[PDB]
Structure 1
Amino acid sequence: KYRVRKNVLHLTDTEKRDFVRTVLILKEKGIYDRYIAWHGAAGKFHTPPGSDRNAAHMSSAFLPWHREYLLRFERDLQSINPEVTLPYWEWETDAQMQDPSQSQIWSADFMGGNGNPIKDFIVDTGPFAAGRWTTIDEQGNPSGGLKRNFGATKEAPTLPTRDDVLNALKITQYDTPPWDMTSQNSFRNQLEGFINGPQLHNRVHRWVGGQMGVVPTAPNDPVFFLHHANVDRIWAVWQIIHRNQNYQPMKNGPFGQNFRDPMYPWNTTPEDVMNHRKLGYVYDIE
């Protein structure tokens, strides 16, 4: 209830600089790669095998899984610099922009810009440009560096809007059977973005393109964590009015998705991360 995750647009120049340095050092230390790997590994743990659910997506644990993911990432940041928290990318505000690629998250100070169409959409500006930041592929081996291609596909030309978020916050059920990408009247599936898809979460990945555009490589882009901080904040808001609306399935869902099941690759259950205050952080505007 103490560490403050701020809007990226509210970070000072110094905070932007100190976040970048901390990420770059986590990368240098070999710790960043753990997060890419953890996320890829969860995508091949299906609940159960034969289904299209997995531990981290496409089912109920999507939200607690990434909250734990971000919680551990932030602790790793804090061990380098105890004054650094994970900011969030309020994309729904950027979607108001005439050209959201002009948002300050994309400044050379911070995330760097869209990919260069002349250079196969390689990101060539910012602290994660090719040459300053290595990437790995899905199989875990070295890759070609950061790629981005904002709004390039016809199904996600734009970012999710504020209205897309307000509509999601109105869903009263955390999730609904069969706890997958076809769940109706489900906050989890609304936010993940499978109704009228791709929307919300799914639509951000599709919008950003590059490595963020294919899930198993998405954390190669630091903006991945800023994106998921915003998703986690939006879940946190849902938990203030739908406070107590808790989690489903409580039981008798696939193993790995129930309230007290471990979320692969960890032992943490959804229950363990239900209250973000007890996890030690708050969002600003909370």
Structure 2
Amino acid sequence: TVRKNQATLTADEKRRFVAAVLELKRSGRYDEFVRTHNEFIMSDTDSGERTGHRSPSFLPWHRRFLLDFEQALQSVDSSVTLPYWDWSADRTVRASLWAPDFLGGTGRSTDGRVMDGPFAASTGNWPINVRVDSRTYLRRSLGGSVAELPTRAEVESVLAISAYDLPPYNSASEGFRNHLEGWRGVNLHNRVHVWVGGQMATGVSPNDPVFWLHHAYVDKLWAEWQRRHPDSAYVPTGGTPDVVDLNETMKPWNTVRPADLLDHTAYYTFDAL
């Protein structure tokens, strides 16, 4: 099972991915992923328990969450895998990612409503149910709130950071995890959520299917970092309050540890690494 750059999918792969996502939404399964993520986003805090975000487990937690979602996709269509969006390469509103045969484009200026693609509210196939902003249609403002996506040079600067994470293991940390997450530095992952806008900029960001392709690329960058720094590994490694240590299990699953997730090749490979 190979995760491919979105820019390379065939028409058939795009069709099958879209259909499987829309079936997970139809059946009610999709919205429970949105709900799980929102609960962690709203509970993880820099001075208290933190698991999904703003913490060393940001990367293995999103790895397992994306595996849960890919497994659900595969239960509808076993050929489908999660594609990734290299936002350092495919950085304009003109990328085929945002075409009507894939995710559809940006929102209209009046109310941010996405008007084309399979997830536009007018299709009847993508109600926004799990929400805080009361509106029930997918919204985006590509490039609205921040002008540019991160560049390859910026990604490279973060990939060169040797330490995985550092105390205090939160949004103030130095180290790779927090620079990739983006709370410090040139800002990679947080800035992409802000760039897409709409629900992707909120606490219910998996409402936009681009969520998965963004995090699949963030997950790819972790794998690339591992290759660059084979003498560097997940920290902390035991006895840290409020923080998932290497061999501690992670909510919500409780049955998996960061240790079980460091090597993606047990689950999937990339088209190229």
1:146-161 to structure 2, matched below 5 A, reads 146-153=138-145, 156-161=146-151
1:163-182 to structure 2, matched below 5 A, reads 163-182=153-172
Question: 1:232 and 1:158 mapped to 2: Cα distance?
Answer: 21
Are the equivalent residues in 1 in contact too, given 2:22–2:125 (CA < 8 A)? Answer: no
Residue by residue over 1:189-238, the C-alpha shift from the partner in whole angstroms, topping out at 9 and shown as x without a partner, is 010011236x1100000100000011x11000000000000000010111
The answer to whether structure 1 residue 8 and structure 2 residue 9 are counterparts is no
1:1-286 to structure 2, matched below 5 A, reads 3-46=1-44, 51=47, 54-95=50-91, 100-118=92-110, 120-130=111-121, 131-138=124-131, 143-153=135-145, 156-184=146-174, 186-196=175-185, 199-214=187-202, 216-267=203-254, 268-278=256-266, 280-286=267-273
Are the equivalent residues in 2 in contact too, given 1:55–1:263 (CA < 8 A)? Answer: yes
Code of the aligned partner of 2:35: A
Are the equivalent residues in 1 in contact too, given 2:31–2:130 (CA < 8 A)? Answer: no
Question: 1:256 and 1:44 mapped to 2: Cα distance?
Answer: 16
Question: 1:9 and 1:39 mapped to 2: Cα distance?
Answer: 26
Instruction: Give the drift of 1:138.
Output: 4.0
Question: 1:221 and 1:161 mapped to 2: Cα distance?
Answer: 23
Question: 2:16 and 2:195 mapped to 1: Cα distance?
Answer: 27
Question: 1:27 and 1:66 mapped to 2: Cα distance?
Answer: 20
TM-score (norm 1): 0.90
Show structure 2 runs of 5+ residues with no match.
none
SS of the aligned residue for 1:117 comes to coil
Aligned CA RMSD, in angstroms, stands at: 1.7
Instruction: Give the drift of 1:52.
Output: 6.3
Instruction: Give the drift of 1:143.
Output: 4.3
Show structure 1 runs of 5+ residues with no match.
none
Are the equivalent residues in 2 in contact too, given 1:43–1:55 (CA < 8 A)? Answer: no
Residue-pair matches, total: 270
With over 3 angstroms needed to count, the CA separation of the structure-2 counterparts of 1:204 and 1:54, relative to structure 1, is same
Identity %: 45
Are the equivalent residues in 1 in contact too, given 2:2–2:268 (CA < 8 A)? Answer: yes
Question: 1:241 and 1:175 mapped to 2: Cα distance?
Answer: 15
TM-score (norm 2): 0.94
Instruction: Give the drift of 1:281.
Output: 0.3
